[PDB]
């Protein structure tokens, strides 16, 4: 029973590690896509704030 339990635990740990890796890859892809989408607008806003002086 103990050997079966440890084998099942190792399999579950491997499955959880694979799921975590897949979720991490998905998250990185989403963040990269959002950054690529919004980068130009962000830089434009930043430059607009930098390149203005009052009085």
């Amino acid at each position: 029973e103990f050997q079966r339990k440890l084998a099942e635990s190792s399999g579950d740990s491997g499955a959880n590690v694979k799921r975590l890796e897949q979720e991490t890859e998905v998250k990185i892809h989403h963040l990269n896509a959002g950054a690529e989408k919004i980068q130009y607008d962000v830089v434009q806003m930043l430059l607009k704030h930098v390149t203005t002086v009052k009085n």
């Binding site: 440890l6 963040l31 990269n32 959002g34 930098v50």
Partner: protein, 157 residues
């Protein structure tokens, strides 16, 4: 067996922490890419030669009004030094118009290298005790710091 399963749970938690730390580090890396792109755009802004002079005049006016000192000593890059030398007394006239004060006796020499400057002026006061760093690279990283929460709010997905 109990401590084996406890150690397995601890290892799973550590793996989860590692994954979330990797995600957070990638987020910070994207933020760094944003900052690099903003720096590149700021450097590109220096290519202008007509509105650039107006921006330099505005910057020097703002700095001189913030110091409100009798004798500043402005420092500008060797590149575009001609623009500062041209604007010259226009800033003094604007400052004297701002309040009923005699025109400052500005002095303009040593200049920091272009990439270090990337536009903007450093004004300071006599003996260099009080320093105002209005460089473009100095205006950035302050706008960035202030607008960072807005950046995260923009990075919904």
């Amino acid at each position: 067996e109990k401590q084996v399963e406890i150690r397995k749970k601890i290892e799973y938690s550590m793996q989860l922490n590692a994954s979330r730390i990797k995600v957070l580090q990638a987020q910070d890396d994207l933020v760094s890419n944003m900052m690099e792109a903003a720096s590149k755009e700021v450097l590109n802004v220096s290519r202008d030669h007509n509105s650039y002079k107006k921006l330099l005049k505005g910057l020097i006016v703002q700095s001189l009004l913030r110091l409100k000192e009798p004798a500043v000593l402005l420092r500008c890059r060797k590149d575009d030094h001609h623009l500062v030398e041209s604007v010259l007394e226009s800033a003094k006239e604007e400052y004297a118009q701002k309040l009923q004060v005699h025109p400052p006796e500005i002095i303009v020499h040593h200049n920091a290298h272009g990439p270090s400057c990337s536009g903007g002026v450093v004004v300071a006061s006599r003996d260099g005790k009080i320093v105002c760093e209005n460089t473009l690279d100095a205006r950035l990283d302050v706008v960035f710091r202030k607008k960072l929460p807005e950046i995260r709010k923009q990075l919904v997905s």
